[PDB]
């Protein structure tokens, strides 16, 4: 699902929302973001903080 | 700067174009004398198809 949503957001949503007669275009998903899923145990191991 | 830097010569675009939110390159042309703009545009489309 996240792969399809990213393709729609990055390749189709912008062009469609700019099409004649189109008002609000709402994405049923979300574009990719660089997700850094932090682990508090590993952050502690090195005395690090987000 | 030499203590914490390295220097290189590379290539890059002095002017980046975009069309409708996507990277683009513009090409200007003229139909050959004795020909219409429609047929020239058709040939350009046929060439771009490849």
CA A10 – CA A4 distance, rounded (Å): 10
Question: How many C-beta atoms surround the C-beta of residue B2 within 10 A?
Answer: 6
Give me the resolution in angstroms, 1 decimal. 2.6
Q: How far is Cα of residue A22 from the mean position of the Cα atoms in its chain?
A: 23
Q: With contacts defined as CB-CB under 8 Å, which chain A residues touch B20?
A: 15, 18
Say yes or no: B19 contacts chain A, CB-CB below 8 A: no
CA B50 – CA B40 distance, rounded (Å): 16
Q: By CA distance, what is A11's nearest residue in B?
A: B22
Whole-Å CA distances, A18 to A12, A15, A24, A47, B26 = 10, 5, 10, 48, 21
Helix (H) / strand (E) element for B48: namely helix B37-48
CA A41 – CA A48 distance, rounded (Å): 10
Helix (H) / strand (E) element for A45: namely helix A40-45
CA A50 – CA B3 distance, rounded (Å): 30
């Amino acid at each position: 699902q996240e792969d399809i949503s990213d393709y729609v957001a990055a390749n189709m949503k912008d062009a469609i929302s700019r099409t004649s007669g189109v008002g609000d275009v709402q994405l049923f998903g979300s574009q990719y973001a660089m997700r850094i899923w932090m682990n508090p145990n590993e952050l502690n191991k090195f005395q690090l903080t987000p | 700067f030499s203590a914490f830097s390295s220097s290189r010569w590379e290539y890059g675009s002095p002017r980046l174009e975009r069309y409708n939110g996507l990277p683009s390159m513009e090409i200007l042309g003229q139909a050959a004398p004795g020909k219409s703009t429609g047929e020239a545009m058709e040939l350009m489309e046929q060439l771009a198809s490849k």
